[PDB]
Amino acid sequence: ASYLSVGYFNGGDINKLDVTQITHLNYSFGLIYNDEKQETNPALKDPSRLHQIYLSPKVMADLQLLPVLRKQNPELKVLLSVGGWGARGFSGAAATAESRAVFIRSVQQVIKQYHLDGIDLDWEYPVNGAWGLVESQPADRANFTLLLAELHKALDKGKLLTIAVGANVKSPQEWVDVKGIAPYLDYINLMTYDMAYGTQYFNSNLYDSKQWPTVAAADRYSANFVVDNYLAAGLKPAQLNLGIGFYGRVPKRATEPGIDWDKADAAKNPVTQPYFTARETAVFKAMGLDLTKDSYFKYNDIVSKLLNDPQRRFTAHWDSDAQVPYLTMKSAEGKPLFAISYENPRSVALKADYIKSKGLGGAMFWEYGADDNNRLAHQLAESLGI
């Protein structure tokens, strides 16, 4: 058996990447010129370029460096990934025969100009939108299928067409017609992370934790559960890459009450209460993580600031059921508080073992700039036999 290792790089530096350890490199992000009224990026509002791909100056400069990287690994495939969390424009781009043709024409132009091997679409998310951050409509689901079918017909034979899809149970069931789009995609990147929300402690647990259990049923996610949901929806295992996050998250449960929305009196009667005080929030703020804005910490920052804290305020632990590491910090009363879960070489190796045991097509990871001296990608490549 052979396996993929599909590495994303958030470039929009790139020379520190060891591309000998991956089969595919996705450069992130291309954006989409769009007319969504809430768009705040002034560069995307050019009406003469509506529905085309926007490349910032840094993105253009980095894409021109790709022939250098190709020398280091002549087998490497390089794609541009368009979209990302918060990226507007897909709903409109996919909506009509006119808009789709503009977008496809732009994809073809970018692949030719920068000698890319293909394109990755990272739409977060069709139908659902994303809590007011991108426009959506129920027609997104059928329109996404049309866009991918028309992209497949337009792309030169052999160029790659891939997508990234969300962990949410509703993605294969309601948002994306996975059986309908499977004929058009070389592989599908499952974003099997970002689970440390609501009442769940862990961000990318492989299985459910018993020691640190998720309280509300609708929050009970694991990478295994996500894979099973896409398989049950009809995707074949060889077409799937299990996504691995080179980062961790402080769970929302540490700082926000957790709601079980299956309760009739849900909003006023939380089932979990926050356990961070201002003391713990200030510790993270002083290290660059403002928990009022976001909750993630890159793996290299976990290593430098948390695992190697001079005053050893963070203690590393292993959850044998979730198969991922986590850190605790001591409260003012000296009690352990669950601070952050993440991925380390041991847990990355167990996810590669899982890939092999299930016959998945490979691994994907987000993102290479957050690795610690390429150690997580190296472990992934070793465990997968890359």
What is d(CA 283, CA 373) in angstroms, rounded to the nearest whole number?
Answer: 25
Residue whose CB is less far from ligand AO3, 30 or 258: 30
Residue numbers 6-65 binding ligand AO3 by CB under 6 A: 8
Q: CA dist 257 to 86, 252, 265, 275, 301, Å?
A: 24, 8, 14, 9, 27
Pick from 187, 276, 366, 368 the residue near ligand AO3 by CB under 6 A: 366
- Give me the residue whose beta carbon is nearest to ligand AO3: 86
The count of other CB atoms within 10 Å of the CB of residue 68 is 11
CB of 31 to ligand AO3, least distance (A): 9
Q: Which of residues 110-139 bind ligand AO3 (CB under 6 A)?
A: 122
Min dist. Cβ of residue 219 to ligand AO3 (A): 17
User: CA-CA distance, 200 to 252, in Å (whole number)?
Assistant: 8
Q: Which two tokens stand for residue 244?
A: 């691995």
**Which residues in 224-283 contact ligand AO3 (CB under 6 A)?**
243, 247
Stretch that binds ligand AO3, among 50-58, 77-85, 109-117, 151-159 (CB under 6 A): 77-85
Q: Residue 136: name the closest of 147, 123, 146 by CA.
A: 123
Choice between 118 and 270, CB closer to ligand AO3? 118
What's the DSSP call for residue 173?
A: I
Query: Residue 226's closest CA among 358, 127, 83?
Result: 358
Q: Quick one: 245 or 270, whose CB is closer to ligand AO3?
A: 245
In the complex with ligand AO3, the residue whose CB is nearer, 84 or 172, is 84
Calculate the alpha carbon distances from 181 to 21, 88, 121, 166, 357 in Å. Answer: 29, 21, 12, 15, 25
- Residues near ligand AO3 (CB under 6 A), total: 15
Binding mask 285-304 for ligand AO3 (x = CB under 6 A): -----------x--------
Is residue 164 part of the contact set for ligand AO3 (CB under 6 A)?
Answer: yes
Pick from 43, 46, 68, 85: which binds ligand AO3 (CB under 6 A)?
Answer: 85
Contact range with ligand AO3 by CB under 6 A, out of 16-24, 187-195, 279-287, 331-339? 187-195
CA 196 – CA 295 distance, rounded (Å): 9
Helix (H, G, I), strand (E, B) or coil at 213: coil
With a CB cutoff of 8 Å and minimum separation 6, the contacts of 341 are 196, 201, 202, 203, 204, 205, 248, 249, 251, 319, 322, 324, 325, 326, 327
In the complex, the residues that contact ligand AO3 under the rule CB under 6 A are 8, 81, 84-87, 122, 164, 189, 191, 194, 243, 247, 296, 366
